[PDB]
Design a protein around this ligand. Sequence first.
Ligand SMILES: Nc1nc2c(ncn2[C@@H]2O[C@H](COP(=O)(O)OP(=O)(O)OP(=O)(O)O)[C@@H](O)[C@H]2O)c(=O)[nH]1
Ligand code: NA
Ligand code: NA
Length: 422
Amino acid sequence: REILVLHVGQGGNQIGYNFWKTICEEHNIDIRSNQRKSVEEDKVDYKSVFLVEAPDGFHPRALFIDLEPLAVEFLVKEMKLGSFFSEDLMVLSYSGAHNVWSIGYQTGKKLIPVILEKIRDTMPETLQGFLIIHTLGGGTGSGFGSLLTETLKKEFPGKGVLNFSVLPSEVNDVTLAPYNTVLSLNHLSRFSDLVVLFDNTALIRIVKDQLNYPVIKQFSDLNFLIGRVMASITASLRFPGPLNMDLMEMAHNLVALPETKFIIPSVAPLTKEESEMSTELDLVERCFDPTHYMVNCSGQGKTISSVLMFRGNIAIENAFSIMTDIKSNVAFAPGVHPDLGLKYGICESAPVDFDKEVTLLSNNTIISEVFNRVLERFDSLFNRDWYTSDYVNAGTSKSNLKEARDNFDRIIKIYKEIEGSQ
Ligand SMILES: Nc1nc2c(ncn2[C@@H]2O[C@H](COP(=O)(O)OP(=O)(O)OP(=O)(O)O)[C@@H](O)[C@H]2O)c(=O)[nH]1
Ligand code: NA
Ligand code: NA
């Protein structure tokens, strides 16, 4: 059940700080010492899923990859997790991708041999899959992340390749993001087994309103929610539970058609103060709400398939009691059976910061509208040949951009066909 994590680019590596901090905290480890705070939970946990053991200290089964060092360096020195984020786990170059998917895809091909050799060292043959954490708007996380997704699926067929990819804010903070996002989602639609999507617009709004935290100057607290989703969906692998599930079990339950592998996540509660104030169904209803969707959505949309991970103070009586109320309040696609569309997972271990928790992975048709807005941005640049020159002069032809564009458009049509039923 072992999992190897790959962080690519500034965003992917910065997110890795909050994820491994939450993983360490859930396993009673202070991320900095690499040593146990307590042995109290070691015997009801399975630390081997994400953590590698050593007398000097725990090590994450992860690689930290970037085509420029500043993002890793400044994070590993400010938070200063030198021992945990051992630098034998870093694969750094110094070119940068300059926000071009093609430059990242290919400068990365130079480090594929050293990344692959570090993988075969780290991985036990009982490894179940990989997690790839990256942003889609930049160049390294998008291009190199696409390359690693393609590389791992062919280097290790039969093993799972899951992607946790960050979309830009609705008003893009990178003008080249539509090109980079379309190119990456095209690569991932092929080589990924499951793509859990985030966008900063939804994350910024959750942080501003739902947590109402004083103020933020690091992506830290937006990345905390991304780390909460990754940790909670893997909780039943690392802690006892009446109903556990692994990476491919969740992907099999979500991917109805081979191309419907793009997932919207949500978690409740986001503040400890409401963990006291909520029941099982209330956490479920709020997860099925746009105010908790970590992707900018209109409404609940039409759910094709969903996975619900229950953690902590969770009445299984009530968890199965409210399944009728779930289908009663959540609109599902016109082709989904009234008794289907749900995949349950129950882990007895509570999250780091809440008394109960419900994590939702939703295969929703509303992702077609999110993708449609990315496509419309793509076309406003592609139809005017704006910024295409350095994609052309980095070896991605317009012909390759158009090929990725129409395959991306085909995915939008598959989701809309499930949505409309006309
Ligand atoms: N949620 C979140 N988003 C981030 C973070 N860092 C960067 N981003 C987003 O990622 C997009 C750009 O990707 P980056 O990761 O910064 O760039 P890169 O992957 O290192 O690629 P290059 O900079 O071109 O070498 C921007 O739209 C940012 O909003 C982060 O730490 N958390
Ligand atoms: Na960068
Ligand atoms: Na950058």
